[PDB]
């Protein structure tokens, strides 16, 4: 049999670092939406890194540093985003928790309070895989690895775009970018262009044991996170290839 689910009642929500980068104009509505979700779900909220990780990559690459040096440097920015988001939710009982706490004590922390925030980057650190000079196991990937290891009820990825397009919808070829309401990880894995999700996310989807679908939704549009957490189709659904037992 597949491994048991550890926290089958958990919803995991990954907030993109580039959503946090928009500052109060994006963060305040998201925080209000999260506040209203606290009574409805048991939430692990994980933040990504965004633009400051690009800057530390710029410096680190100029200094010649290898990919295992760059991985924790980027992860730091995701942790800072998590501290910012948790501070905005502190009055509702929400705090940031560290990676060892997420890995070993999430059950008691979600018994103490309704949601906690953590960094979405996984602790690959100096043992990041070689090949690319850019750390491959980033925030989408970390959040999915946790959600699937826990056997969570879902993972929802909160982006600054409506979902996945056939080309970067903010890029040079944005004229030909068509929106994809639904896709499979295997179909995505064979495309070559950019995505709003880590390519390593598709890899960990292939070996997944529980999470059957992951929805990417626009966090800049109030109500889409709420709808996604109820299963409503409001962004791009990614089918992982996992089937029910």
């Amino acid at each position: 049999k597949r491994p048991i689910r550890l926290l089958p009642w958990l919803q995991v929500v990954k907030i993109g670092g580039r959503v946090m980068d928009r500052g109060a104009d994006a963060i305040l509505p998201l925080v209000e939406e999260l506040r209203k979700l606290l009574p409805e779900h048991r939430l692990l909220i994980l933040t990504g890194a965004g633009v400051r990780a690009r800057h530390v990559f710029s410096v680190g690459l100029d200094l010649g540093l290898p990919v295992g040096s760059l991985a924790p440097l980027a992860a730091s920015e995701a942790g800072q985003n998590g501290h910012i988001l948790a501070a905005m939710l502190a009055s509702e009982g929400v705090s940031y928790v560290e990676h060892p706490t997420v890995a070993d004590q999430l059950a008691i922390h979600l018994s103490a309070t309704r949601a906690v925030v953590g960094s979405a980057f996984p602790p690959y650190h100096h043992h990041e895989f070689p090949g690319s000079r850019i750390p491959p196991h980033r925030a989408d990937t970390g959040a999915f690895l946790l959600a699937d290891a826990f056997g969570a009820a879902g993972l929802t990825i909160v982006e600054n775009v409506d979902g996945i397009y056939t080309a970067d919808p903010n890029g040079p070829d944005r004229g030909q970018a068509r929106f994809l309401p639904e896709t499979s990880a295997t179909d995505l894995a064979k495309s070559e262009g950019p995505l709003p999700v880590d390519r390593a996310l598709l890899d960990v989807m292939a070996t997944a044991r529980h999470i059957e679908r992951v929805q990417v939704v626009n966090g800049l549009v109030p109500g889409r996170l709420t709808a996604a957490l109820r299963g409503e189709h409001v962004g791009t659904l990614i089918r992982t290839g996992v089937r029910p037992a």
């Binding site: 491994p3 690459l61 540093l65 290898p66 990919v67 690959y124």
Partner: protein, 268 residues
């Protein structure tokens, strides 16, 4: 390429953008600990065997660090196999098993470290940046626990819940990240054979082979974790590894001296 082109791509594209990926690949390449050698001391193959196996290797390490800067990582062994058996039987996932196995590599590092302490060689976390020990002739070596950090975020294998990245991968990736000059796995067989030498009577010794040749013969998961072979093919710095028998007196000393004992496995 240029710094500017790279910084512009880093600001304007997804990290998944092929154009950005290619600009990053042209970056300079700094080796953090270029003069060090990473050694893995096997858990099942060496430390689990006790005094008869470990004491001579301790003497070799003490002698070798006079001429060679060493990062010495431990394997895990039979107590990790026991933990994996219990936890897999409960249906626990790979990420939970991964944490369990770390503890056993830690035990083994403690035991080795206590035999080395009077010789000035510490057990450390952060071996790759253990700058002070590695710069001293009185020291010139450190011991570390060989499991990778992934713990609950371990990627599972395609089948089963045994963690696929264990202490061969842990040690290899440290060598690779720190740009070390050499990676030596110390086990309990002379090197690679055409079949399992413990199982097959007429297995033929292989002194040198590429990862592709190993796969073409079906040796992907033999004396090394098969995921290490893939990591080796992607590596920037450590593009071959050597596998040696730590049970043969002096074998580690001789490998450090550039003797071709054992098997050399090449990325290409």
């Amino acid at each position: 390429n240029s710094t500017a082109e790279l910084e512009e791509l880093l600001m304007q594209r997804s990290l998944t953008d092929p154009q950005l990926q290619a600009a990053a690949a042209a970056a300079a390449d700094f080796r953090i600990l270029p003069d060090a050698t990473v050694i893995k001391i096997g858990g099942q193959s060496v430390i689990d065997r006790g005094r008869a196996a470990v004491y001579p290797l301790v003497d070799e390490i003490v002698a070798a660090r006079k001429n060679h800067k060493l990062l010495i990582g431990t394997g895990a062994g039979t107590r990790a196999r026991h933990l994996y058996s219990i936890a897999a039987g409960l249906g626990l996932p790979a990420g939970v098993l991964a944490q369990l196995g770390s503890s056993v590599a830690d035990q083994n590092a403690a035991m080795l470290g206590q035999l080395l302490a009077k010789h000035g060689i510490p057990v450390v976390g952060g071996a790759g940046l253990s700058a002070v020990p590695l710069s001293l002739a009185e020291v010139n070596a450190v011991v570390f626990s060989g499991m990778p950090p992934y713990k609950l975020w371990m990627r599972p294998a395609a089948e089963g819940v045994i963690p696929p990245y264990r202490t061969d991968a842990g040690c290899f990736l440290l060598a690779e990240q720190f740009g070390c000059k050499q990676m030596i796995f110390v086990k309990d067989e002379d090197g690679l054979y055409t079949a399992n030498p413990k199982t097959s009577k007429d297995a033929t010794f292989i002194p040198r082979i590429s990862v592709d040749e190993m796969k073409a013969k079906g040796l992907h998961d033999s004396i090394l974790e098969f995921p290490v072979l893939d990591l080796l093919q992607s590596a920037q710095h450590v593009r071959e590894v050597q596998v040696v028998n730590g049970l043969v007196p002096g074998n580690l000393t001789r490998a450090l001296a550039g003797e071709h004992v054992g098997t050399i496995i090449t990325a290409s």
